[PDB]
Design an enzyme around this catalytic site. Structure first.
Site, PDB file in Angstrom:
ATOM      1  N   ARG A 172     -11.729 -44.492   5.405  1.00 55.28           N
ATOM      2  CA  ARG A 172     -12.168 -43.370   6.221  1.00 55.28           C
ATOM      3  C   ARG A 172     -11.010 -42.747   6.991  1.00 55.28           C
ATOM      4  O   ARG A 172     -10.987 -41.537   7.208  1.00 55.28           O
ATOM      5  CB  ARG A 172     -13.306 -43.820   7.144  1.00 55.28           C
ATOM      6  CG  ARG A 172     -14.475 -44.379   6.325  1.00 55.28           C
ATOM      7  CD  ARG A 172     -15.820 -44.392   7.032  1.00 55.28           C
ATOM      8  NE  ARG A 172     -15.986 -45.527   7.924  1.00 55.28           N
ATOM      9  CZ  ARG A 172     -17.068 -46.301   7.959  1.00 55.28           C
ATOM     10  NH1 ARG A 172     -18.087 -46.083   7.140  1.00 55.28           N
ATOM     11  NH2 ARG A 172     -17.124 -47.309   8.811  1.00 55.28           N
TER      12      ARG A 172
ATOM     13  N   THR B  32     -16.288 -46.350  12.082  1.00 59.79           N
ATOM     14  CA  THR B  32     -17.402 -45.479  11.716  1.00 59.79           C
ATOM     15  C   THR B  32     -17.015 -44.001  11.743  1.00 59.79           C
ATOM     16  O   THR B  32     -17.377 -43.237  10.843  1.00 59.79           O
ATOM     17  CB  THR B  32     -18.598 -45.698  12.665  1.00 59.79           C
ATOM     18  OG1 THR B  32     -18.963 -47.085  12.657  1.00 59.79           O
ATOM     19  CG2 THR B  32     -19.795 -44.869  12.223  1.00 59.79           C
TER      20      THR B  32
ATOM     21  N   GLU C 188     -28.464 -56.626   1.784  1.00 62.66           N
ATOM     22  CA  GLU C 188     -28.233 -55.343   1.134  1.00 62.66           C
ATOM     23  C   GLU C 188     -28.076 -55.451  -0.382  1.00 62.66           C
ATOM     24  O   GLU C 188     -28.626 -54.636  -1.120  1.00 62.66           O
ATOM     25  CB  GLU C 188     -27.028 -54.655   1.783  1.00 62.66           C
ATOM     26  CG  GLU C 188     -27.258 -54.403   3.274  1.00 62.66           C
ATOM     27  CD  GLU C 188     -26.059 -53.813   3.992  1.00 62.66           C
ATOM     28  OE1 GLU C 188     -24.974 -53.706   3.380  1.00 62.66           O
ATOM     29  OE2 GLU C 188     -26.204 -53.467   5.184  1.00 62.66           O
TER      30      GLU C 188
ATOM     31  N   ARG D  46     -14.849 -54.364   5.596  1.00 60.99           N
ATOM     32  CA  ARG D  46     -15.052 -53.554   6.791  1.00 60.99           C
ATOM     33  C   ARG D  46     -13.716 -53.085   7.358  1.00 60.99           C
ATOM     34  O   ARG D  46     -13.612 -51.971   7.869  1.00 60.99           O
ATOM     35  CB  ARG D  46     -15.837 -54.335   7.849  1.00 60.99           C
ATOM     36  CG  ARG D  46     -17.280 -54.599   7.450  1.00 60.99           C
ATOM     37  CD  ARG D  46     -18.111 -55.081   8.627  1.00 60.99           C
ATOM     38  NE  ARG D  46     -18.301 -54.052   9.653  1.00 60.99           N
ATOM     39  CZ  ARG D  46     -19.031 -52.950   9.502  1.00 60.99           C
ATOM     40  NH1 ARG D  46     -19.660 -52.706   8.360  1.00 60.99           N
ATOM     41  NH2 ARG D  46     -19.139 -52.085  10.502  1.00 60.99           N
TER      42      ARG D  46
ATOM     43  N   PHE E 260     -31.099 -39.049  14.578  1.00 58.52           N
ATOM     44  CA  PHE E 260     -30.308 -38.659  13.419  1.00 58.52           C
ATOM     45  C   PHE E 260     -30.833 -39.327  12.152  1.00 58.52           C
ATOM     46  O   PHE E 260     -30.337 -39.073  11.054  1.00 58.52           O
ATOM     47  CB  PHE E 260     -28.837 -39.029  13.641  1.00 58.52           C
ATOM     48  CG  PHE E 260     -28.615 -40.479  13.975  1.00 58.52           C
ATOM     49  CD1 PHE E 260     -28.789 -41.467  13.010  1.00 58.52           C
ATOM     50  CD2 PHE E 260     -28.231 -40.856  15.257  1.00 58.52           C
ATOM     51  CE1 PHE E 260     -28.582 -42.810  13.318  1.00 58.52           C
ATOM     52  CE2 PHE E 260     -28.022 -42.196  15.576  1.00 58.52           C
ATOM     53  CZ  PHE E 260     -28.198 -43.175  14.604  1.00 58.52           C
TER      54      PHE E 260
ATOM     55  N   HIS F 216     -19.790 -47.227   2.859  1.00 55.71           N
ATOM     56  CA  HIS F 216     -20.446 -48.218   3.712  1.00 55.71           C
ATOM     57  C   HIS F 216     -20.163 -49.623   3.192  1.00 55.71           C
ATOM     58  O   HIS F 216     -20.085 -49.846   1.990  1.00 55.71           O
ATOM     59  CB  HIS F 216     -21.967 -48.019   3.721  1.00 55.71           C
ATOM     60  CG  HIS F 216     -22.732 -49.247   4.125  1.00 55.71           C
ATOM     61  ND1 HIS F 216     -22.821 -49.674   5.433  1.00 55.71           N
ATOM     62  CD2 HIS F 216     -23.392 -50.169   3.383  1.00 55.71           C
ATOM     63  CE1 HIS F 216     -23.503 -50.805   5.480  1.00 55.71           C
ATOM     64  NE2 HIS F 216     -23.861 -51.128   4.250  1.00 55.71           N
TER      65      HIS F 216
ATOM     66  N   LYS G 287     -21.129 -43.200  -0.502  1.00 53.89           N
ATOM     67  CA  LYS G 287     -22.185 -42.275  -0.110  1.00 53.89           C
ATOM     68  C   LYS G 287     -22.112 -40.980  -0.918  1.00 53.89           C
ATOM     69  O   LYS G 287     -21.104 -40.704  -1.565  1.00 53.89           O
ATOM     70  CB  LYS G 287     -22.093 -42.011   1.396  1.00 53.89           C
ATOM     71  CG  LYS G 287     -22.208 -43.295   2.222  1.00 53.89           C
ATOM     72  CD  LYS G 287     -22.117 -43.039   3.720  1.00 53.89           C
ATOM     73  CE  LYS G 287     -22.201 -44.344   4.488  1.00 53.89           C
ATOM     74  NZ  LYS G 287     -22.165 -44.131   5.957  1.00 53.89           N
TER      75      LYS G 287
ATOM     76  N   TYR H  64     -32.046 -48.416   6.240  1.00 49.14           N
ATOM     77  CA  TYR H  64     -31.710 -47.943   7.578  1.00 49.14           C
ATOM     78  C   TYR H  64     -32.855 -48.192   8.555  1.00 49.14           C
ATOM     79  O   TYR H  64     -33.063 -47.418   9.489  1.00 49.14           O
ATOM     80  CB  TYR H  64     -31.387 -46.450   7.543  1.00 49.14           C
ATOM     81  CG  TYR H  64     -30.067 -46.113   6.889  1.00 49.14           C
ATOM     82  CD1 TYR H  64     -28.865 -46.579   7.421  1.00 49.14           C
ATOM     83  CD2 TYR H  64     -30.015 -45.303   5.755  1.00 49.14           C
ATOM     84  CE1 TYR H  64     -27.643 -46.244   6.843  1.00 49.14           C
ATOM     85  CE2 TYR H  64     -28.799 -44.962   5.168  1.00 49.14           C
ATOM     86  CZ  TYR H  64     -27.617 -45.435   5.717  1.00 49.14           C
ATOM     87  OH  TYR H  64     -26.409 -45.089   5.151  1.00 49.14           O
TER      88      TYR H  64
ATOM     89  N   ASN I  42     -18.915 -39.958   6.292  1.00 50.49           N
ATOM     90  CA  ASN I  42     -17.839 -40.938   6.245  1.00 50.49           C
ATOM     91  C   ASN I  42     -17.715 -41.726   4.941  1.00 50.49           C
ATOM     92  O   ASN I  42     -17.336 -42.895   4.934  1.00 50.49           O
ATOM     93  CB  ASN I  42     -17.919 -41.876   7.465  1.00 50.49           C
ATOM     94  CG  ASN I  42     -19.176 -42.717   7.491  1.00 50.49           C
ATOM     95  OD1 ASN I  42     -20.032 -42.613   6.614  1.00 50.49           O
ATOM     96  ND2 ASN I  42     -19.290 -43.568   8.506  1.00 50.49           N
TER      97      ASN I  42
END
Lengths: 149, 149, 149, 153, 153, 153
Positions: free
Chosen positions: D106, D95, D130, D89, D61, D119, D13, D53, D116
């Site tokens: 993270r 998260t 994706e 993951r 948010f 992804h 990100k 998203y 964070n």
């Protein structure tokens, strides 16, 4: 003082992970008392995995463990057996948690780069099988007082 | 903003882990607002570990924290107290998980290299005991907007 | 024993390089005897850069070191002054060699993240200027016999 | 072995780029043993961000979420391997970085949910989805790893 | 101050991808303080590789070099910064890894000229030419670094 | 011209074991790309130490060399590669750690000549001599590296 057998499997050598794996136990604070790059003869590997002689994957297991040199290690320290097992992580690298050797550095059970004795008894058994008594080295660590009270 | 007290015990200095420990919290994203190598006085050590004054290991504990210089630290950040505790790991290094400071770098409870306040108020209380008035340095991080929305 | 003054500049703190820089000297084998995060007052800065008060860049030099907190350090060891200078690298990070602190971690003279005394004389002078009475800590390193004959 | 190889989408990100964690994040997966087959620094258009998203467009948010992911370049990645979706993951962590365990990305490198840093697809199906959404035709690179026989039977 | 921010092309060669050094190499430049503005794993078409090494087209090793640079994917990169062209060259080290000094990428991680992991433009002119050749106009991503005021005066 | 594969003896002296630098030193050479063909923690017998330092037998400090090398366990290593002898010396750095350059083992990790952590053969002749001296006839392990084609043409 409790000792345990730790071995970097052939894939660990091929991937250049020998120093990195040794460093994890050195930084942890345990004492290295046995170390050697070794080409495991078939009979010794088969004796190590004796209990699996009847399993279908036995032939593959022996071929794998003798497919390249391994690095044999003996480490000393109170609770070293259980601790080494924890630092290494679960048998399946996909399941092993991040932070552990297999969790950070491997992806498959059949190529899980390292082994650690699962109990103090197997620790003595394995060290006695893979090493020749005169190969272990005793020494007094300068930082001993700072690693354990 | 929440603050916590983190201290590198004498064994951490002797083993040269000061920078390594600081880096773990810097990389995490928390703000360092207090730092100093310090010679802990018996008095201060006893006030800090008052919740263990009646323990039989209390004396050995006091002399240990005074067995050499320590490194006092004050860190800032939302949730920093609980987060530092998690990054530090269980009291017994053998049980602390790989990935945590104690889990990666220590082997015995009596020599577990570091301490972190157990609660926000204790963070406030410990920072007040170990640091002086303007000893803490408040500043604004250039990356603030990228660590917290 | 020879001592030298090493200081992480404001940009080093902002970029989160405090731990990394400390580790470099810790790993090298020198003894940390003084450490503290500090907000340098204008007058002390001008004092530090005493001989450059007539320079055109003097005012910029002063704002820079006072633009944020710094981490003051005192290191002890035979030949530590010259060695610290070698580890830090050329004044201009672009020219500093890979392997040195500035050569690996900075890109401009005006933001060269760290400082080291340029002579044993300036080492004593600088430590005397930045550190107050009782802030330095002396101790006996457990690995002393393994770092020096 | 006849294990099924899958692919997962992993993205650094905007905060990861600003904090200089691109290489460190890539290394975690490289060292793990998975195969990198897609990689690119990319500026995500508002449209792509919302399509990505979509299941959160109703959230409060969401507005900031979209502005956040488009507030700077990101690094798109496609990784291949058996169980790579679930493994990625696990390597990334919970998260909320404060709760993520030390050892995870993270858990070791972030402090807040909204920032964070990385992804990873949550399922093999979203992995395919994706990768198809972020990577164009021909951007993926297939190759044979020299160490393949040492990472998997 | 007012300085000229230039751009340089840095490419991780096929051997770097096979050895899992992509993340490690990126981290060296990120940690140095330079800005990544272009990135992509790429399978170099034969023609492009021949254009890139155009000046060596008559050399006896040319056929082998082209075959090699196209033998696996590479990772293309565009980095920005003041003096980034010469700095990147210094960080990479001498052409022959055995001679490259410890501390440099080649000095620390390679052993032979033909497999020296990474390339950096040797001049700003070549940085512009190489970025223009390997990258498509819209692939570069410009951004403002939050740490800008802490990397340069 | 093309040179042959070479072999060198690298030893972590007693201070390296005491400081827990065994893994770190091995990694420097592994990462460089050389092949490890011999490794063992070893307690040096006095007779062997005498042969190792035979070229310094007339030196007043000869006794000291023997006593030190026999005072605690050492780690013996045999590394193979083209130009590995000179390369290892380069990675190790100058005899005096204070003068050794940052980036080298002694430049980064030591402060005094007497405690300079490691030894590397000073010539290919001595590399072969030392390997035959420190390792028992059946202790070397030969193997084909999966990454060979990616480390050298």
């Amino acid at each position: 003082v409790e000792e345990t057998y730790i071995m970097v499997k052939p894939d660990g050598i091929q991937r250049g992970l020998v120093g990195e794996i040794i460093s994890r136990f050195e930084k942890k604070g345990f004492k290295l008392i046995g170390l050697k790059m070794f080409q495991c003869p078939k009979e010794l590997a088969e004796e190590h995995y004796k209990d699996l002689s009847a399993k279908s994957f036995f032939p593959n297991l022996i071929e794998y463990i003798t497919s390249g040199p391994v690095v044999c290690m003996a480490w000393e320290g109170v609770g070293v057996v259980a601790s080494a097992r924890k630092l290494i992580g679960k048998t399946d690298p996909l399941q092993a948690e991040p932070g552990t050797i297999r969790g950070d550095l491997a992806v498959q059970t059949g190529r899980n780069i390292v082994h650690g004795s699962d109990s103090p008894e197997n620790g003595k058994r394995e060290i006695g099988l893979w090493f020749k008594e005169g190969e272990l080295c005793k020494w007094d660590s300068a930082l001993a007082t700072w690693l354990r009270e």
